[PDB]
Design a protein around this ligand. Structure first.
Ligand SMILES: *[C@@H](C)[C@H]1/C(=C/c2[nH]c(/C=C3N=C(/C=C4\NC(=O)C(CC)=C4C)C(C)=C\3CCC(=O)O)c(CCC(=O)O)c2C)NC(=O)[C@@H]1C
Ligand SMILES: *[C@@H](C)[C@H]1/C(=C/c2[nH]c(/C=C3N=C(/C=C4\NC(=O)C(CC)=C4C)C(C)=C\3CCC(=O)O)c(CCC(=O)O)c2C)NC(=O)[C@@H]1C
Ligand SMILES: *[C@H](C)[C@H]1/C(=C/c2[nH]c(/C=C3N=C(/C=C4\NC(=O)C(CC)=C4C)C(C)=C\3CCC(=O)O)c(CCC(=O)O)c2C)NC(=O)[C@@H]1C
Ligand SMILES: *[C@H](C)[C@H]1/C(=C/c2[nH]c(/C=C3N=C(/C=C4\NC(=O)C(CC)=C4C)C(C)=C\3CCC(=O)O)c(CCC(=O)O)c2C)NC(=O)[C@@H]1C
Ligand SMILES: *[C@H](C)[C@H]1/C(=C/c2[nH]c(/C=C3N=C(/C=C4\NC(=O)C(CC)=C4C)C(C)=C\3CCC(=O)O)c(CCC(=O)O)c2C)NC(=O)[C@@H]1C
Ligand SMILES: *[C@H](C)[C@H]1/C(=C/c2[nH]c(/C=C3N=C(/C=C4\NC(=O)C(CC)=C4C)C(C)=C\3CCC(=O)O)c(CCC(=O)O)c2C)NC(=O)[C@@H]1C
Ligand SMILES: *[C@H](C)[C@H]1/C(=C/c2[nH]c(/C=C3N=C(/C=C4\NC(=O)C(CC)=C4C)C(C)=C\3CCC(=O)O)c(CCC(=O)O)c2C)NC(=O)[C@@H]1C
Ligand SMILES: *[C@H](C)[C@H]1/C(=C/c2[nH]c(/C=C3N=C(/C=C4\NC(=O)C(CC)=C4C)C(C)=C\3CCC(=O)O)c(CCC(=O)O)c2C)NC(=O)[C@@H]1C
Ligand SMILES: *[C@H](C)[C@H]1/C(=C/c2[nH]c(/C=C3N=C(/C=C4\NC(=O)C(CC)=C4C)C(C)=C\3CCC(=O)O)c(CCC(=O)O)c2C)NC(=O)[C@@H]1C
Ligand SMILES: *[C@H](C)[C@H]1/C(=C/c2[nH]c(/C=C3N=C(/C=C4\NC(=O)C(CC)=C4C)C(C)=C\3CCC(=O)O)c(CCC(=O)O)c2C)NC(=O)[C@@H]1C
Ligand SMILES: *[C@H](C)[C@H]1/C(=C/c2[nH]c(/C=C3N=C(/C=C4\NC(=O)C(CC)=C4C)C(C)=C\3CCC(=O)O)c(CCC(=O)O)c2C)NC(=O)[C@@H]1C
Ligand SMILES: *[C@H](C)[C@H]1/C(=C/c2[nH]c(/C=C3N=C(/C=C4\NC(=O)C(CC)=C4C)C(C)=C\3CCC(=O)O)c(CCC(=O)O)c2C)NC(=O)[C@@H]1C
Ligand SMILES: *[C@H](C)[C@H]1/C(=C/c2[nH]c(/C=C3N=C(/C=C4\NC(=O)C(CC)=C4C)C(C)=C\3CCC(=O)O)c(CCC(=O)O)c2C)NC(=O)[C@@H]1C
Lengths: 289, 172, 162, 194, 162, 172, 162, 172
């Protein structure tokens, strides 16, 4: 599980949050809890005004006319969901959001993008939503009566690439999935296309270097190809992600976010230099050996 | 970086073939557009201070929250940084206009600028609004009929408007 | 990619200043040269294949041993002759690119950088390509500004190879 | 042991010049501009001229160039690799005294002339105590270097030319060739003609 | 001293390269602009006294307090009026220099560099010089390339002042 | 640096006076010969390798002791440095021809070069002889009438010769 | 210079430490190789004239055009042959220097550094010197360590050339 | 820098002929004592701290004015600098002993040392006295017969003494 780093990430509130299940012969609080959980999770923690609430779907779920899975399907096919997540987004971002909301996980590979983009283009959005919800993964994780939840912990058919990409899609508890730094841009297009991973940067209030985002181009690669040779004698190399660089001012500072591969022996100096340039360290990852 | 000619050249080398007659004629047409392009560059350059100052004044009039205390454009250094950012974006728009290609604007100006602004807390939407205001001001300056050989600059104006749009979409 | 416009923008950007009348005159010079460059590239392209075969033949004439000496680096077989004609065609096509772009930028980007390593490891004499460029100069049949600019690119290649 | 304290001297770089970009402003070769391969060739050649004056292809470091192109290392790291390279050690360290190695290090890393003989004297002990790379890293991590060139810009001779003047100070590649009269007489030059 | 020729040489020298066709086109553009620049410089020179006097009067009219209040930085007395006329003459003469050169270089190093600290130290309002340059723009009576280039220099000074 | 226009500009600014009519007419005459200057620069640039190599070979034939063992041109590195230096001097003389003023050649190449060659043991007189051989070859390239509009280029040739012997005097 | 002793002291000096057991082992390896290197140098010196003549003749046989076509870079005349024999002598003499020193350092500082520039400037094909060095390989008549060291230097020169 | 082999190589290359048979015999002779040279380098390196400390103590004993207040060896920083220079001079004479040529010692340690000592006010004669003390200690340590295969080491001891004398005369 995630214990020591749960609070630093946004995982701690979901560690003591048990899955919301609608039992047979449920009470009215159970129905309202299912409605609340579905709104929070399927709509990605957006505030839901009263005028946008799906009154009929709520009534049907309360009555038992539809299951939790059907209510999730109705919410995901609603005009509210399409306004929030479909009409203003690149379809790869739509797929990321679908996986995050309906399956509680990030996409694993480019094959899922292929399948979902082909299915949207050939049969429409409703059929694509159905494929998320009628999937074997959905059935094994949530089934018919459980609200989908974030699957932070390791499971049977996982890939660790999904664990890394979850924190690219999830940015903290007080965050709303339409209120993230990257806004409407797809977070995983480059990663899924290149089968790569990014160093995990935690949410704002727990991580000073939360705002680090690589640019379109001119990014320092993950590994130190060449070893320690350009740095003279060095023991080990580290990739350091730095955000909020401002002190020298333009033109000395062009991009406020910079990744640098530095030797172990210059780590002290690198940290002091970061403090001087007013930056915040987002992550430090071994780059050699 | 790329200009209008070298973009076609790079694409042709990637195909490993000579430029076709159609591409040579299109570049000749671009050459025939060169004086209008130089006039547009010169007109934006000659009014750069007025464009930046008037756009910034309008932006802070429509968005007073920027200049109230606690706002991002409040305090003299942040205000100076804001004005400077606007002038830099305008300058790179003129670079893209001069070359006929957006490569200079994308690579040297807009690369990482959105990420920079969110890392510093600079509201990118307000930057886009200011860029929009520079866009309307600069396009009105480029289309001014007084004191210039009259002719049709609609293609140049559309290209410049596209450069401004790229800048505003990138910063937001 | 060296061009009048990219160099003007690069100079202004390094100085962090708006384009001045200096860069405007740079654009005016590019405009003055561009038409003649474009028809130089067209004329070179239309007569490209014949120019390439003639340059190949000229190289074989000046260096006969290239056609009767065995080895991967020579043209004593059809494979070698084909690679020689391809190399000369590469030189000619990139020269047309330079005429289109108004500078040696295509030559630097695609051919000049690293040509010495290629000629060393594959044991290719740069004098062969120099002779090919001399034939192209002598037979491209251009005049005026087209001739001047084109011959500047061919001489840039010759100087790079020598 | 701490470095000896040496007094600064009046220099153009110590004082505000109110510089406006012109033909005498050194070209800013920076990877922050997302440079194409040909612009990277130009930047790399600028680094070779700044560090080695001229670099024969025996002197080139193609592995370092590939690493700088890929973004593995910064421009400052490439400059360090040039200074730690065999060319720089053989030409500028081996053929000179320690004092005239500090010069050829202050001049081409910091882009300024040495304050005095005392500065040369103070920094000359660093090679023998902290190591060669110790001196290189001290100069590269210095506030002067980072404030002027940072990580992404090739160093250059700073404020060589004042506005309006026909000629500025001598370029450091003219003022300070790789060696001087000591290695000159070790080689046996000057040679008599005819 | 920024001009087309010196910048072409700086670009070629910063890359350790000979002068290619790009630099030659820069010189051709400079040659296209130079005759108009020289005639613009001549026209401004022959009308220099009237332009300077009119610009001074325009500044005095737009800012009447300059001719009324006492102070070293104002033109209430003959000393301030002579200083103001001398400053405006400096602007006009350096603009003619820029027209001759083909760049903003004369303005850059004779006038523009450090003018901020000049205005701050001596309490000289840059809006005064802005209005003088505006009058020069409105009354120099130039046309064609002559006007465009001269106006580029005048707006360069105005942009530097605002 | 200074160019042909800027030299007159600098004297006039030092005297604090406008360019006279005669100075403007002289600059107009300079503009009139600009094509000859550009094509002379182009001709030297297009024959730089031949000029450097032929001049070097002639120099080592007249001074065999330069290339005999122990000579300053002996060993490959010293020989290549000498060739490079020839090429550098030629390039800066082309710069001076292009600008029409010797400021770039003096400021960037010539000033202090004698002390550089004294510090290295490079025989400056032999460098001057090499520069004279380059001058002879370069004047022949500029003066040949094949494939060019015929004209009187004596003034530009004299200016180039002045730059070349200026370099020869500077290194001696 | 690349030699076991010079690099041992150089690498110890560059990091400011006393010689250790590692530099002692480097010196021991130098002592093991030194007598063979000196003997190889003596053997190459004794028939240096025969080796140089045979290598030059081998280059002329594999490249007959070098003795036939007229040119400054060719050996058609006695001047070209003298230049060629002198070049082969330089290669062999510096190889003997490397054998004496124990490393490729004499080749690096006297011949290899800026050999590329030479060959390109004077149109001297490196394949000529490669064939000369292969003749020196095949006709030096050395054995044991002497042959292996000397062939390593000759192959070092070949690898630099090719 | 050079080593015992590269020095002969450099002289021969300057005069442009092969090493003579006598020169090769001399180098073979030099590799015959190579084991003794390695022994001498190892013994001085293994006793460097003792040599430096004992020589410094003896020097300040016979020259009290160095360590008196106001003396050049007074204060911890200057005293540590003195101990540093002794250690560095000893290290470079070990380098010279190793390579078999004084060039490393001359090039890296003694070139400009006297002028530096003059500028700093360091008494060069006292430095010469200290390095003479290091000489007597190091030569006693090299010539120690215990724990080593007995042999004649007079030649290597004379070479080391010459290096130490050269270091003393550079500053004296
Ligand atoms: C003395 C140096 C030799 C000489 C020169 C000469 N040239 C011209 C005219 C022109 N030369 C050019 C040059 C170029 N055109 C290009 O586009 C480029 C490529 C970048 C170059 C270098 C031009 C544009 C002209 C004008 C048009 C024309 O073709 O005539 C002249 C004629 C007078 C003039 O200055 O225009 C002369 C005299 N002629 C000789 O006899 C000398 C050997
Ligand atoms: C004067 C210097 C003293 C002296 C020296 C001496 N030594 C030898 C022989 C050897 N010494 C060594 C040395 C080492 N072996 C190691 O592994 C290391 C550590 C890395 C060292 C330093 C070796 C290998 C030899 C050869 C084998 C042997 O022990 O005989 C000699 C013998 C002659 C020779 O030149 O080899 C001598 C004379 N002897 C004295 O009396 C001086 C005080
Ligand atoms: C009010 C004092 C200021 C203000 C606020 C404002 N906030 C939003 C949007 C969101 N606020 C939150 C915060 C939370 N959601 C949670 O679940 C929690 C607890 C875990 C917190 C703290 C979120 C996530 C959002 C985005 C969701 C949404 O539906 O917007 C807005 C709306 C912005 C918009 O609609 O574009 C506003 C206006 N605005 C002010 O001017 C006040 C200073
Ligand atoms: C055809 C003219 C050229 C071409 C196309 C090509 N594209 C892909 C792959 C993808 N294309 C997309 C596009 C979109 N995603 C969206 O969200 C939208 C609509 C809103 C678009 C237009 C995506 C996401 C992919 C990845 C998924 C997929 O592979 O289908 C490929 C396949 C790439 C591969 O290697 O798999 C191809 C071939 N290729 C050419 O050569 C033509 C010039
Ligand atoms: C044991 C040798 C060391 C160690 C391990 C450790 N790991 C975790 C937590 C996780 N491990 C993974 C890894 C994977 N998930 C996958 O899906 C895959 C296969 C495709 C892998 C390899 C993940 C993602 C986690 C976190 C999620 C989860 O655990 O479910 C922990 C727990 C850390 C914590 O509680 O915060 C530990 C302890 N720890 C050591 O000290 C050993 C050196
Ligand atoms: C003005 C319309 C808005 C605004 C601006 C603002 N920007 C900054 C700080 C920086 N801006 C940059 C700019 C760039 N980096 C590049 O490389 C490019 C292209 C060449 C650009 C445009 C950078 C690097 C910084 C940081 C360093 C510096 O300040 O120079 C600030 C200051 C932020 C702070 O608090 O430090 C501000 C205020 N802010 C608004 O409110 C407007 C909407
Ligand atoms: C388009 C936005 C507006 C417009 C443009 C326009 N301009 C021309 C013609 C020219 N403009 C120039 C420019 C300059 N000459 C100089 O010396 C300077 C300073 C260096 C500049 C900027 C030139 C040389 C020409 C050609 C000659 C002429 O004076 O006409 C045209 C005419 C067609 C052409 O492309 O040449 C046009 C259309 N006119 C409008 O109505 C727009 C508002
Ligand atoms: C023709 C003048 C002579 C000749 C030619 C010849 N060339 C090769 C092999 C190569 N030529 C190149 C050159 C280029 N590749 C590029 O991409 C460009 C820049 C755009 C150039 C100039 C290269 C890289 C090779 C080697 C790899 C390849 O085959 O493509 C050969 C064959 C060499 C070999 O097979 O080892 C030959 C024969 N041969 C003659 O005799 C002519 C005088
Ligand atoms: C004013 C009272 C007089 C005057 C001054 C003047 N000085 C310069 C140029 C420079 N001044 C310095 C001085 C310093 N550098 C230092 O390090 C120190 C201590 C911190 C000082 C005081 C330097 C180095 C320069 C050159 C660099 C630069 O100017 O930026 C000038 C300019 C000369 C020129 O050619 O531009 C002037 C005019 N001149 C007078 O007439 C007054 C008597
Ligand atoms: C006229 C528009 C207004 C005005 C003028 C005024 N100026 C000054 C003083 C100075 N003016 C300059 C400016 C320059 N000197 C140069 O060399 C150049 C560049 C070539 C320029 C533009 C300077 C430096 C000064 C101060 C030193 C000097 O006296 O020369 C004054 C006097 C200020 C004082 O304190 O004495 C005045 C009065 N006054 C008006 O009221 C006009 C509206
Ligand atoms: C050739 C005709 C003669 C010759 C040349 C020679 N020069 C050197 C070494 C250097 N020459 C320079 C040159 C310059 N520095 C600059 O900044 C410029 C102007 C922009 C020039 C012209 C320098 C700095 C050096 C030293 C550094 C280096 O060579 O890399 C040498 C070799 C000296 C050496 O071993 O360093 C030679 C051989 N020598 C002759 O015999 C010819 C007469
Ligand atoms: C022989 C294999 C072929 C050949 C030879 C040839 N060489 C030259 C000229 C030069 N050779 C060198 C080489 C060196 N000089 C050195 O000092 C060293 C390092 C110690 C080397 C390797 C140089 C520098 C030259 C040019 C200078 C000179 O005049 O000697 C020539 C003459 C070239 C010319 O243009 O004069 C020739 C003919 N020629 C053949 O045909 C053989 C196959
Ligand atoms: C000790 C025997 C005597 C002594 C020494 C002393 N030296 C200094 C200062 C320096 N000594 C050096 C030395 C070197 N420079 C080199 O390049 C080399 C070869 C590698 C050497 C050995 C240098 C450069 C300095 C100055 C820099 C520094 O000290 O860090 C001092 C200190 C002087 C002062 O602090 O002002 C002293 C005291 N003094 C005695 O009295 C002894 C006789």
């Amino acid at each position: 599980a995630i214990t020591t780093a749960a609070s630093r990430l946004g995982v701690a509130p979901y560690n003591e949050s048990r899955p919301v299940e609608l039992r047979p012969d449920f009470s009215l609080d159970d129905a309202k809890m299912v409605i609340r959980a579905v709104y929070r999770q399927v709509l990605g923690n957006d505030y839901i005004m009263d005028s946008e609430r799906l009154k009929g779907a709520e009534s049907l779920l309360t009555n038992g006319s539809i299951s939790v899975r059907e209510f999730v399907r109705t919410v995901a096919k609603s005009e509210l969901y399409k306004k929030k997540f479909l009409y203003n987004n690149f379809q790869t971002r739509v797929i990321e959001l679908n996986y995050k909301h309906l399956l509680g996980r990030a996409p694993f590979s480019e094959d899922e993008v292929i399948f979902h983009l082909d299915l949207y283009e050939n049969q429409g959005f409703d059929a694509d939503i159905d494929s998320y919800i009628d999937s074997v993964e959905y059935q094994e994780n949530f089934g018919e009566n459980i609200v989908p939840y974030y699957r932070f912990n390791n499971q049977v058919g996982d890939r660790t690439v999904g664990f890394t990409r979850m924190f690219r899609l999830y940015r903290g508890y007080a965050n709303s999935d339409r209120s993230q730094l990257e806004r409407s841009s797809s977070r995983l297009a480059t990663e899924l296309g290149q089968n790569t991973v990014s160093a995990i940067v935690g949410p704002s209030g727990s991580n000073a270097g939360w705002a680090y985002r690589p640019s379109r181009a001119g990014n320092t690669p993950a590994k130190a190809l060449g070893g320690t040779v350009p740095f003279g004698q060095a023991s080990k190399l580290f990739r350091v992600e730095i955000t909020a660089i401002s002190a020298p001012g333009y033109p000395k500072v062009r991009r406020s976010n910079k990744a640098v591969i530095v030797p172990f022996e210059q780590l002290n100096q690198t940290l002091q230099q970061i403090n001087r340039l007013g930056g915040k360290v987002a992550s430090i990852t071994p780059a050699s050996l | 970086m790329f200009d209008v000619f070298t973009r076609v050249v790079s694409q042709a080398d990637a195909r490993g073939e000579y430029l076709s007659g159609s591409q040579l004629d299109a570049l000749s047409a671009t050459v025939a557009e060169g004086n209008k392009r130089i006039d547009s560059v010169n007109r934006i350059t000659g009014n750069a201070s007025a464009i930046v100052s008037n756009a910034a004044r309008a932006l802070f009039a429509e968005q007073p929250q920027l200049i109230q205390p606690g706002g991002n454009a409040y305090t003299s250094r942040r205000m100076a940084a804001c004005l400077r950012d606007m002038e830099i974006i305008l300058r790179y728009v003129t670079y893209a206009t001069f070359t006929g290609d957006a490569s200079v604007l994308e690579d040297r100006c807009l690369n990482g600028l959105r990420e920079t602004y969110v890392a510093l807390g600079v509201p990118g939407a307000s930057v886009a609004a200011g860029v929009q205001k520079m866009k309307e001001a600069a396009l009105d300056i480029v289309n001014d009929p007084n004191g210039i050989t009259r002719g049709d600059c609609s293609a140049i104006v559309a290209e410049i408007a596209g450069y401004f749009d790229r800048a505003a979409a990138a910063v937001a | 990619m060296k061009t009048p416009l990219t160099e003007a923008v690069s100079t202004a950007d390094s100085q962090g200043r708006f384009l001045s009348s200096t860069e405007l005159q740079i654009a005016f010079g590019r405009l003055r040269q561009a038409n003649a460059g474009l028809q130089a590239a067209k004329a070179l392209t239309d007569n490209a294949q014949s120019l390439v075969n003639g340059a190949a033949q000229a190289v074989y004439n000046k260096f006969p041993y290239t056609t009767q000496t065995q080895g991967n680096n020579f043209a004593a077989d059809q494979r070698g002759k084909d690679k020689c004609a391809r190399d000369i065609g590469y030189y000619l096509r990139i020269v047309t690119y330079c005429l289109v772009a108004g500078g040696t930028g295509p030559l630097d980007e695609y051919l000049i950088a690293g040509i010495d390593e290629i000629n060393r490891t594959f044991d290719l004499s740069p004098s062969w390509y120099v002779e090919a460029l001399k034939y192209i100069k002598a037979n491209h049949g251009l005049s005026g500004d087209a001739r001047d600019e084109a011959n500047s690119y061919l001489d840039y290649a010759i100087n790079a190879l020598s | 042991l701490p470095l000896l304290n040496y007094a600064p001297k009046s220099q153009n770089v110590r004082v505000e010049g109110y510089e406006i970009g012109s033909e005498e402003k050194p070209v800013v070769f920076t990877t922050e501009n997302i440079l194409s391969s040909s612009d990277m060739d130009n930047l790399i050649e600028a680094a070779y001229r700044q560090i080695f004056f001229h670099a024969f292809k025996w002197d080139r470091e193609k592995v370092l160039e590939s690493q700088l192109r890929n973004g593995q290392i910064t421009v400052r790291d490439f400059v360090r690799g040039l200074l730690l390279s065999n060319t720089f050690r053989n030409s500028f360290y081996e053929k000179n005294s320690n004092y005239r190695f500090v010069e050829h290090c202050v001049q081409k890393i910091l882009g300024r002339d040495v304050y005095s003989e005392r500065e040369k004297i103070a920094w000359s002990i660093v090679v023998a105590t902290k190591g060669y790379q110790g001196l290189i890293d001290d100069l590269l991590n210095s506030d002067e270097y980072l404030n002027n060139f940072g990580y992404d810009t090739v160093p250059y001779q700073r404020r060589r030319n004042l506005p309006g003047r026909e000629a500025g100070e001598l370029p450091f590649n003219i003022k300070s060739p790789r060696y001087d009269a000591y290695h000159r007489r070790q080689l046996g030059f000057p040679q008599i003609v005819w």
